């Protein structure tokens, strides 16, 4: 479960910034 | 010698508020000849003497060492209003004298300034008289800050007098700044305990506006920098960390745009203020990241939660913080370094 | 010639473009001293003026971008100004021998700093379209702030300070500012004088006078103090003195509203004819209230005490609200002997 | 209204320089009462009126036609001194009014400024009066520059008046600088022909000191830079090269230290002055050296003659040119060619 | 801290007159960031110290105060021009710092003023340095008054510095007026014996013009009143009667209009000058009356001789005394009083 | 009948 | 002789003043 | 006459 959140975060951080 | 006695009586009439028993052309002529057949130092010192005698006699009225402070201040004011009125008319009669000494390049002060020195020395310089004047002036300001109504016109007239006498700084300004510092230090500390950050910010803004009104109305402008800096220090500077750690999280989590705008406006006034807000702005985002890797609010699909947060924060930067880029870059750098300290 | 001047010309251009000064400073200071002590064709001042004029004339184009946000436009003016000052200060450091010599030689030519101010005024702010969009934005922020919106006060202070250093604060801004302040508070006076009772109105007037005193302290020039406060005092108080008493003084006295009465005296103290116009209606109120209590008694107590209750009520008001004012006591005695 | 009538006579007595037939406290009462039982903006307007009435009557004296300029200026000066004395006393009686408007922030001028406006409006604003005033003031300055004695106190008072009325720059300063320019421009060319360089330099120094005296005495301080610059330009700047080409060789060939020191002092005041002098210094040394190796003297050995010149020349740098390095370096570089 | 190291090297380059090994835009960022993240205080205190270090290192060159005075003064001048040149540039790089503290109502001195305090504290305040500086400045003024040529540009630059450092009045002005007093007091006494009244008056006017020139050229304008008052007193005020009884009669008997016009101009500058002259004008006319009734005078008729005197004397009143009424009345009163002394 | 007590108070006060 | 000069002075003083 | 151009160059080197 947490491994998925880190991947979703890395995507959002690149998409957003 | 008959000529000088004419002027001696004319001055005495002006000082005693009686009648000038001569037509003025006779009096103006008297002045020109005493400069035109004798030495003028003679006449300047003679007028200095009859002004000094009268003014030395005005000190006794202030010796009732028990009477209401406001009445004492009103008595100083009228004595001052009378001194100016007397000296201005005396200056009018002796005008040929006062401009001749500019022509003769004398170092002796003008008739107006000569009266000011005498008034300073024999009345206002008096330690008991000056102390009761400043005490009352300060006590008047202390009352206004506590909510009481006072005569601002009186305060302006007395302080303007102290400025004209060039003793505003030594006698009043430093002690005034000392009492303002001591007062708002306590007020800052107490309401920092007794009220929440939103009502505390509104109060600080009201005091800063009040002190600006007192400055315009009856204080001298040369006090602007020191007074405003003093209030800014004691109500904001000494509490920056305390204000943010007490209310900022509550302000950002509840999306209270108006209080955040005022928080930004007030912190802009103080050295280090926007920076201290900026650091805690960063810590708030790092905190947000560290709870979304542990606790997703299982209502939305995480991408929406990260997008709901970003808009909320984008809006706060846009309106409360005036589109400040430094807050946008700091948010980017915060997210882009938080992801780097991710488990391998 | 030539050779040496190219050293300074490249140093100046590096300063203008924010690049690198490719010499040790002692070499540049020496260059200035040489061109001033062996005059050839010379007049290094006129050449320095030229490369400053060229660079500054190139700065006009950024302010012509169509449909650009006002705040962004103001920020470009400020950035342009902060760059100009910083560059000119450094040029002045390199050329210190030049303008200290021209002062030692008692020259009529402006200092290098003033020469920069003249050029900046001439080619940037003098432009009618540029100045107009500059002043419009400055006034618009003040209007937004008076309407409750948050603005960058530091930006306002920097721009208005610029207008002062350029010696056009009075021509370009203060005139229009007072005109817009006059229209705004004139309207606000008429509007809130109908919508709110006198107690809520007086609190608001005091709130604005402190706000306007705050804007003076924060970003306006100190010479605006007299005209601004007089304008607000006129449009919120002077134009309504008589209307305020006929609307609220009776109710304030009958229900004994000490705090609102104290404030009425403080605000009326600010305006010529104010304490006096109040004193007139103070007389009318006593004659009315008294001459109707001898006609209609509030048959609760006898007449001697109800009259003694009244003087107590009024004396408390003179003592605290009107600050022991003798003239109000004398007016009360005169009224009682009517 | 019986109260106001008291002051009308008091003001008129001051204006006609007669007797104030009331005790001063009685008048102090009149002003204090009329400001507190009506609006004060009703007592100020009346005082302007009777001040306007009186001052409008003073214009007729300046119409006499074919009247001597100095007498005209003295009539202006008396009118001004009378106005100030009257207004200063009027201000004393009406002090409560003057400060009531100051205490509250009125836009109405102080009584003193109100009087200044009336004096400007009804006396000086009249072009014919102002033009005859400025012509006379400039004519006195011209008379003094030509050596005649004038009343500087009159000059100081009138210019001070123009400053208090804030027309010093518009009406006087510009015309003054223009007349200073034309006078010294002509004087520069004229004495540059009529007098030798030593006498010309002495005269230029005398003028620079005189103009410094006129500046301290009766001109305004803000005229200082432009005045000194104008005199420096027309007596030195326009003649730098011409003075040297006429006199420098004679000054050096006779070792005239005192006149040479003055030359350095005066040329230091002007842009390029030391530079043009330094240039001709090179030309003089190159010339003198090349005329002793091509045509030698006959006393002792020539290398020694090449040393007396070095003694003579080093001495001039030491005293006349104040140890100025640029003159030492230029002397060597001249000899190496 | 790596960011600050760039600016520290740039400042050291400015101080040592070497090369700035960075592009300027890079340096402006360093200033703008350090004011926006590390609080501006810290950056002000760090800049102050490296400025104090460099300037405190400049005192050692002044440690040999046996050196030639002008060379010492020129060494002070170069040290000052270098300090100004450097501080102006440091001000340019740190302009964002100087404008932040003004926007924030700071009590901290500007970067320029901070440089002034440090320069005064470590350089000019040094008693040995200040004493050798002031001595030489006065010594150049003394040399010029004695006719020697000096560097006025050096003198102006040194005095302007003392004003910029706000120590012109205490350290220089009082001693300057005291030396001006002593010099012209003696010069009055000495030249009053060595030169006749015509040559003395020309000389007094020559000094007043020279001293007016020294004010324009290198002294501060606040010295104007006291300086001229000193020269007027020591060359005229202390000698009025002595000038008249030594030269006035001869000037009038010989109709020396130019010297008479100048006498009136110079006496107009001094308190009692026109007065003492008017009294001796009376004595001269009473004298004239008493010798025309004693002598039978056979050249012209007495009416002829009395009419030539009136033309001559009217002319002197007209041009030399500027039509001064007080002198016409004194002549009328003199002749009308003299004829009443007539024997019975 | 009250115009009597008022004038009495006015004299006393 | 001197008595005459005093007489002429008195005349001149009246004619002139 | 040419014994002086040489004396000048010597003095110029020495001085
Ligand atoms: C599992 C994981 O590491 N995913 C992931 C998604 C997106 C990105 N995007 C960028 O790096 C720009 C990295 C990693
Ligand atoms: C009926 C009546 O009014 N009588 C009366 C009233 C007042 C006074 N007051 C004084 O004498 C001071 C007298 C009589
Ligand atoms: C001898 C004698 O005293 N003569 C004399 C002549 C003329 C006057 N004139 C006046 O007094 C006006 C007096 C006396
Ligand atoms: C005639 C000739 O060759 N003279 C001569 C003069 C000088 C020098 N050298 C120096 O002056 C240093 C060489 C030759």
Numbering used by the authors:
A (entry chain F), G (entry chain E): 1 to 17
B (entry chain B), E (entry chain A): 196 to 539
C (entry chain D): 195 to 532
D (entry chain C): 196 to 532
F (entry chain H): 4 to 16
H (entry chain G): 2 to 16
Can you list sentences taken from the study reporting this PDB entry?
We further characterized by x-ray crystallography Helicons derived from these screens. We solved the structure of H314 with the CUL5 N-terminal domain (CUL5NTD) at ~2.8 Å resolution, H313 in complex with VHL-ELOBC at ~3.5 Å resolution, and CUL4B-specific H316 from C77 in complex with the N-terminal domain of CUL4B (CUL4BNTD) at ~2.9 Å resolution. Notably, the co-structure with CUL4BNTD reveals binding to a site that is not biologically relevant since it is not available in the native context of the CUL4B C-terminal domain (CUL4BCTD). This result highlights the importance of biochemical and structural characterization of screening hits to ensure they will be of functional relevance in cells.
